[PDB]
């Protein structure tokens, strides 16, 4: 099934971050949409939770180097 989460990047303050975070994102299997936000260092992800899940979200981030939890 298809989902939307949003996640907090408390991390992304460098001004090619957004694009950092959103290429690791992209990158998941399963993954249909990234947009990030480096305002509110946030990042809106749609994905199949059959091919994957928000654990494999954040720690595909966390690996780019930007550790990300759900929005608050």
């Given at each position: 099934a298809t989902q939307t989460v949003t996640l907090s990047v408390p991390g992304m303050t460098c001004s090619a971050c957004p694009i950092t975070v959103k290429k690791a994102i992209s990158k998941v299997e399963g993954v249909s949409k990234v947009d990030v936000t480096f305002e509110t260092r946030q990042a809106v992800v749609t994905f199949d939770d059959a091919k994957t899940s928000v654990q494999k979200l954040t720690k595909a981030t966390a690996?780019?180097?930007?550790?990300?939890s759900v929005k608050q």
């Open positions: 690996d780019a180097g930007y550790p990300s």
